[PDB]
Amino acid sequence: GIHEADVGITLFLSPELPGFRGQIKQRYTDFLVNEIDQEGKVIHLTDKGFKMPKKPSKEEVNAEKESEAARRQEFNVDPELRNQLVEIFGEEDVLKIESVYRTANKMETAKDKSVRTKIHQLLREAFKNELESVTTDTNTFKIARSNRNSRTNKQEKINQTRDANGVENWGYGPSKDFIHFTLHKENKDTMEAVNVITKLLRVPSRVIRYAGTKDRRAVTCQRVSISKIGLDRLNALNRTLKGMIIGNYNFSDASLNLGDLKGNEFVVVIRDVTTGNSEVSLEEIVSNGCKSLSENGFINYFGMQRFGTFSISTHTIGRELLLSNWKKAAELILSKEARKIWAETKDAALALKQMPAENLLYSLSNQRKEEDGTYSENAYYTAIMKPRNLRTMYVHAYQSYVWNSIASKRIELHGLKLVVGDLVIDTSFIRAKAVTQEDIDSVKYTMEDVVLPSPGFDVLYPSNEELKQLYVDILKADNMDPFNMRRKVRDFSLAGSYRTVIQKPKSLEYRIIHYDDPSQQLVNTDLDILNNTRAKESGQKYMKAKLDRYMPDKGGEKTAVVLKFQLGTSAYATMALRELMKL
């Protein structure tokens, strides 16, 4: 079991202030994550799609039936392409052709590979509408009207999807390349939820796209685009969908992409709250704690999520891969029954036969154990190089490890005071810039502007030598040089991204409410609020309680701190709650 201290997380921004013990994500409705779109609006589910009419009017049909007649007769062929078409067939057939375009009739005709399809051009293009037949009986083109009898294109019998006001897609716009929608899910991964949608629609996974992944052990809302599908079927999913509801349809030419969001709005119910500190109130603790969150912020540490299952920490493996110590890297990755065999024997083939990354062992099950029963360094390399998904993930754990470590020292040394020769970004790749003693006095940049880089080959380190000295020192300890950070493999060390040192949550609002059972919910989902509002028409409202986000304070022994806030895309919600609570 690896601790916070064992991954660079050592410090707090305001350790003077008392914290409080608590438990988060007890129920799924104790963690709301609502996406914030590119503009700054929070995404909420405000409907469960639309209701399908069973009858696909009679005055609608004869309106667009008479509307078609109008344009057919009003439309005239280009005189240049007409008197040409006369030469081919004759002034009588051109009139038979013009007549089928207007009406629902077939023209007879009466007559060479070279100009067999030169006629098929001057028909399609001149009349715009299409022709029925290629050369049929003998060498004559028996061509009636385009596909449809009653409409233009056939592609333009979309008219079967008409609204009361006569709107093309059940009140939604004209069709477009992408349908954007809102995805309300409970205890499902973003990837899981969207890939359910595609599976049910019999479509490849690549049609559906999202801006960012939301917490699973939570109820979350986000926007999702999807192509090669029509509303009618997408809308029909809500009938068969398990722990997720789809709504708020909008057609658009754009698809969604990773990064099409500003951040996320969280509502966190902290349950079973105890203060310990018996000198100051809870209301006092929280109030000052949140004031510090909003004023000062928290250290934008990488959470545990980027160091994996509390065992052989991924960063210590990452270190070995970067140092090109292949045997050591593998031995660490190998440290249920299979790992007992490997430590007891050393036979890869024996160890393989134990599971119905470790599957290293397949690679080492081939090759040859040399003498000494020692696998060759060059054999371990070959074995390491067998997925880049995990391989990179390891080296990334080392970067994040070094970062957290440094970001701690940056605060430890100076703190929230902005020192000269620090690093910021200017709104003009993402290029850094060393801060002058001047622009400190200009108070142009504040602490929340300050960034540090991930150790890498394509990344400027702090100008300030006593900060530059951390990188060399911290890495020297693990036998690496921050300036000679390029490597020979896909372990290229990355360029090394820039990352803000602190993060201040936005619209931070706390609220203390006392309860009895862990079972009962103190926060309503968007779906809860919808169904009880949508049934203000119906009349049978569960309670006024479930129109508001928060349930009212009933009273009890137990104390919950439910608090709401927005974070950047870079920030771990855990690392925000940590600063408040001191856990």
The structure tokens 């077939």 sit at: 106
DSSP string, 345-374: S--HHHHHTT------HHHHHSS--TTTT-
Q: Give me the helices (H) in 212-323, please.
A: 231-236, 282-295, 314-322
CA dihedral 394, 399, 405, 408 (to 10 degrees): -130
Q: Which CATH architecture has domain 390-500?
A: 2-Layer Sandwich (3.30)
DSSP state, 160? Answer: G
Backbone CA torsion sign across 416, 421, 425, 429: negative
Measured from the Cβ of residue 359, the count of other Cβ atoms closer than 10 Å reads 12
* Contacts (Cβ under 8 Å, ≥6 apart) of 479: 323
Let me know if 176 is exposed, middle or buried by CB neighbors in 10 A (0-12, 13-18, 19+). middle
Q: Which amino acid is at 22?
A: G
Q: Which of 388, 67, 52, 83 is nearest to 237 (CA)?
A: 52
Task: Please name the helix (run of DSSP H) or strand (run of DSSP E) that holds residue 246, with its range, or none.
Answer: strand 244-252
**Cβ proximity of 362 and 338 under 8 Å:** no
Give the whole-angstrom CA distance, residue 256 versus residue 390: 26
**Secondary structure tally for the chain: helices H, strands E:** 18, 16
List 30, 37, 163, 215, catalytic entry: 215
* Tokens (6 digits) for 156: 């333009």
Q: Give me the helices (H) in 116-189, please.
A: 118-124
Task: Please name the helix (run of DSSP H) or strand (run of DSSP E) that holds residue 343, with its range, or none.
Answer: helix 338-344
Measured from the Cβ of residue 343, the count of other Cβ atoms closer than 10 Å reads 12
Question: Is beta strand 208-210 parallel, antiparallel or unpaired with respect to 423-425?
Answer: unpaired
Q: Which of 262, 265, 266 is nearest to 211 (CA)?
A: 262
Q: List, in sequence order, every residue forming a beta bridge with 564; answer none if it has no partner.
A: 267, 509
Question: Is beta strand 31-36 parallel, antiparallel or unpaired with respect to 263-274?
Answer: antiparallel
Give the whole-angstrom CA distance, residue 409 versus residue 397: 19
Resolution in Å, one decimal place: 3.2
Domain residues of the chain, as ranges?
Answer: 5-29+263-300+503-581, 41-55+164-252, 58-161, 390-500
The structure tokens 């169904």 sit at: 531
* Tokens (6 digits) for 103: 């009406």
DSSP state, 474? Answer: H
* Widest CA span in the chain: 106
* Contacts (Cβ under 8 Å, ≥6 apart) of 317: 329, 332, 333, 394, 397
177 is catalytic: no
Give the whole-angstrom CA distance, residue 27 versus residue 277: 27
Question: Is beta strand 298-299 parallel, antiparallel or unpaired with respect to 219-221?
Answer: unpaired
* Tokens (6 digits) for 36: 């914030």
- 3 state SS of 270: strand
Give the CATH fold of the 41-55+164-252 domain.
Answer: Alpha-Beta Plaits (3.30.70)
* Contacts (Cβ under 8 Å, ≥6 apart) of 123: 85, 131, 143
- In three state form, how does the secondary structure of 167-186 look? CCECCECCCCCEEEEEEEEE
Task: Please name the helix (run of DSSP H) or strand (run of DSSP E) that holds residue 95, with its range, or none.
Answer: helix 91-102
